[model samples]
Target chain A: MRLFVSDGVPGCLPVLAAAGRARGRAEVLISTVGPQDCVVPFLTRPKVPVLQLDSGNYLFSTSAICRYFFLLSGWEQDDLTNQWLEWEATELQPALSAALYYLVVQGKKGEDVLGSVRRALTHIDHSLSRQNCPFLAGETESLADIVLWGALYPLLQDPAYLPEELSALHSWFQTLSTQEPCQRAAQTVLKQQGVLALRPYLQKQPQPSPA
Target chain B: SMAAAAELSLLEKSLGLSKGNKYSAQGERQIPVLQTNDGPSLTGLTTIAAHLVKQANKEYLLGSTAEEKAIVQQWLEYRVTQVDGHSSKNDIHTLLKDLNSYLEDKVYLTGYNFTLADILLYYGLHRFIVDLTVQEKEKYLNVSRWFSHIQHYPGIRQHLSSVVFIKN
Candidate 1:
């Protein structure tokens, strides 16, 4: 049977696209699209192969995925770096998202539409530092790089629009953005052409205080 | 030994959901509740606890049919339904009764060293002591003993600090 998955956006779609691309002789298909800026509806049963370990089991999140991938790729011996890389991916995204949203006033109520571009840049800067081995998990790209690349796509769009203070993040983001697989996934998931079809219907959304 | 006082404090810092607080009544308790990081979470202690024991990662907290994801949804829903949503911290007596009754003879619920069931049961038992009555403490002797025994285990002792009750 053929394996199939698709990103509903261009930049964000790259990983899925790359999976299709990197699959080489394997069977895979990816649907690529752009940001609709609105919530899109889709259903996904967990894909077992996309997240398997040596015991042939699946893990819960990117941390498990990275560790599993590192072990599978034979980088398990690099314990200190692999563990650190996995932990960062697991911690940073949700932590930063939590910190930013906690300050939003509408806090949990309003749309968190202000650009998180700089926040993304800041994290990317920390990951791709000159002080490190040039990769989050180390020398060669691994599942750790794939996840961060996917996670970073939203903010990496339009450097001209980036703040003057984000130079460090911008540079790091630029460096990782060059990876072929990451670029493919990024494009497929974050910058595709289906931008306007995902808006949520608010009339049925219990009007906030007609109060 | 005020478990509720300590629990609410940790709950606030870890989950930021003080559903029992007046601030919550004003509806400020948005964001996540019970477990950390957004409602209907698929990760964290609840998930990790389940993961450790090799349980399938479906939304099985409550059990199969009438139950939900492991014990979290069950107790979280229990905390909301049987008591009153997030403020069930007042119901210490029932929890102490359940923990001792459930754990008294068994080494573990499903078997060994604390599954998500025990962790959640710990949360319940901890909340049970919040502003707990002095007599209630004396009443659930086995629970107190087990709680004491578990307060220093490497995997979960830190959470015991979240327990509080019987203040002078």
Candidate 2:
């Protein structure tokens, strides 16, 4: 299998992490691709974080790619896993994107622009506190934790950007960040440049109408 | 919402799943929640539908191999976040255009077989396709072709009105 990632594409971080964990189980060729790489010919635009399997098939969507890696590694996605994946893609991704749009593109302060992200974080904190679990999926480091962490990694790595008193969420992120695969994925995408690395990729994305 | 829930029921019946497991739809987005007696409550349309697919003894529809499974999930996510993702954010025109391009050389979204993604996407696009005029359908020729094909699939179109398409 081949995984195509690009510099500073936040989605690639999760994909690379999942691929890294499944390294022994699958033969993966991890390639750093550019925006117009012609990876998936079916789609009109150049979408990043695409995975091309040995079967001459391609898997798009960052969440689906992460889940696919887990599945390939012989782990089946359960209900809780799927639920978190859905939430991350639909709810948290948009919030995170909205936050990034203002924080980076619009030249807004991180604090002023992080309200949507904070609301999402507060909700996560409440859920974690209620479950009383270390990871999002109860006991182990599941795919959900990997995906949510990557989605927030660009901003949350600083820890200072986090909202007030979301202890459970904060701790959850801290633990995941320290993991080997997570660290490798983050470094591969960001190259220690931190969130600033993502500016180029994010800049190429057309702003979804703020209306 | 209630609309997607209704589509789920029709899918269950189509899959030969019994009506015992009731679902509660919550949130403004109508994320479906199913409280399983054997385990934790399942949430969201894709999650719950997948659980139901497992229950009906037809896991084949979910895809048998690894890559196909991933491909199936990819399109399923597309159904929710893109097809049904809605607007308060707009991309309806772009979506149809993209699907038309996407399906140009394919019969199914994943592979040769008809998987769960096809069903969920057809349901999601039903209303949109139903309202399309002849010229509108032709504009997205490949989408109309795929949508028409899914609606014609065995036992898939229960509880939904049949959409008309030109034979040409």
Candidate 3:
């Protein structure tokens, strides 16, 4: 299997997650592509998170790729797993992305984006509190866990992204981080792609001075 | 809004019809009434979503299995009656919070992938989300997240553009 990823942040997370699932059996090849590279056109629709299996078939979108990998890892077609996977992609990914990337790269500033991150985390914290299960999908860590871990990895680099109030979320995140697969995945990214190349882009701009 | 274009476009996308179709009509309510290539005509968003999915030979939208289909139908009906029918702030707050909680650990209303349930609920909730004050919108972060996720599809994008989303 071959995965093409961007050199920074989320683009590498999926590849690392897939490699972790592949273990020693599947020969996973990693290729780094620029955000606007021509290779994206041929890989898949919504190409950023593209993964091409040994079958020559390609899967696009983070959710699609994660689901495919988990299924390959002998995970069942469980509804709860599906639900949490979708929730991470839908509810969690966007707010986190906007808060981390948009604020730094685009110099966009607003309570709206930050509020989105807080609300999403609050909801996650509440969900974690309601459940005694460690993973979002239940006892076993499913694709939902991997995807959430991937999103959280880069953001955890910054203090602003982690809220002290969400203790349940912190524990849940910590649990996932300590797992072998997640630990290996993060280590792989750090060794292969280096640490959060997008970090400089994430720094908050200084506020305008009054005349 | 240009109601007819919006209606026809939805029919075209839903039915997977390439060119123009003859049976589609604008009803008294100004809602699009789609008469599928077969004989039966359907009105209202709920029926239209149900009928078109069946007509397009895409039952997966309903669900790949019986149990999943039931959940899909359950939420589809809930969106129509509970979410769309009442737009009062109290109603919105309660329902959005309910949806947020229900969706906290799951993705779609039914199964793992995009289903008729998601499309129907998304369309019904579109107007309400657009009208929300920025502060109000922030409260239903989970709902907003799901909406943003669903809107990534081109089919949903067409339906969203049809309605003018109010700016905050």
Candidate 4:
């Protein structure tokens, strides 16, 4: 199935989840749009595709949207891993929103926003350190990795607030980032902005909006 | 923890509202009206308390049967009415004063190894104390006893501490 994805931060969650599921088979239609542009062709579409799916936040909660996408993609259903997946998704939801809220509402940036991000990282570090297993729930990568890995991808832009202490999580991020589908999705985004090569993820990349 | 309860009870005592009873007034201005799909919902400390009861599957904090679900639901309504609205600091101070007073005597809100009431009360109470205070902290004595008790439990404690935050 074809998926429509945005090149923005929040938009990346579904794109990455789909990319992971696709394994380079399913075709994705990419575009970049702000929150304002999203309303068009919805409230004003003269015709709608019979099997169309747009991924990311709309009226629904972001975590709910990610969960819905995984379910729709047929990526495993309710299980122990799925429960932890949901918990992780919910856990990140508030912190991400809080950071963005600080940005959008408070006009705060830099180290100020870093504080919320750091708290979130500490929490993640504590959780990961406590877990005796490989993945958040088990050995295999579950939906939690996809949901969070995408939501957090943009945080890489600011080196000042990067999670330094969580080495396992850092390695996990590298593994996900370099994987085929995530690479492809990232390529789709970079290529749209006319960047050809995959840059080192640790080199502090600029936040790329869809061209 | 009895001190804390007595403090909360005192709110009921002074307001001429019955202590340890459900309070529901429809069409009244609900404080801390969290926007929901439903029209403005009313609640107080009852919200936290009811969730604990529900999460733990404890029928006592709720009623003894399916009918008690409705009873617990009503009491939960009483809780949110008591808790939400007002500035965070003021509300927490009020809650802490009540809980501390009550807990000074009883070992738990429900008087033992923490009923849903204690869990509900303490979770928000703990969070508020952290979020609101600098060097200040709540003195739960009994509440702390139960708070420490819940911390030793597996499921709820795990959720409270688990983190999904990262900078990748």
Each model's TM-score? 0.40, 0.90, 0.51, 0.41
What tens-digit string does per-residue lDDT give for candidate 2 at A30-122?
Answer: 888787777887776788888887877778899888888888788876778888888888888888887787777776776666776787898
Per-residue lDDT of candidate 3, residues A1-211 (tens digit): 7777765545467446655665655666778765655443332223455666664434445555665565556555543454454445544665676666555555554553365578777877887788888778578767767777787776654555667788888888887777776676666555554334665424432332111
Error of 4 at A188 (Å): 3.3
lDDT of 2 by residue, B1-168 (tens): 137678778888888876756778777767778888677778888888888888887888888887788888899899887777554224677788888888887899875889999999888888778878888788899898898899989899987889999863
**Best by the lDDT measure:** 2
lDDT of 4 by residue, A1-211 (tens): 3334443334444454544443333344444443333332222221111113332212122333344344445554333333333334434544655665555445567866666666666755675677776656557665666666666665543444566677666666777777676667565554444211212221222232211
> Lowest lDDT 10-mer window, candidate 2 chain B?
B84-93
Q: Write the per-residue lDDT of candidate 4 for residues B94-168, one digit (tens) a residue.
A: 555545554555554433433444444444454454353323333434445445555554444433532221111
TM-score of B chain for each model? 0.45, 0.91, 0.75, 0.46
The full ranking of all candidates by DockQ, starting with the best, is: 2, 1, 3, 4
- TM-score attained by model 3: 0.51
Shift in Å, residue A135, candidate 3: 1.2
The segments of candidate 1 whose C-alpha lies over 4 angstroms from its true place after superposition are: A1-6, A9-63, A77-120, A126-132, A194-211, B1-168
Q: What are the interface RMSDs of all the models?
A: 13.9, 1.2, 14.9, 16.2
Complex DockQ per candidate? 0.04, 0.75, 0.04, 0.02
lDDT per residue, candidate 3, B2-44, as tens digits?
Answer: 2444644564585585656543555343544556556544544
| Top DockQ hit | 2
lDDT of every model, 2 decimals: 0.38, 0.82, 0.60, 0.43
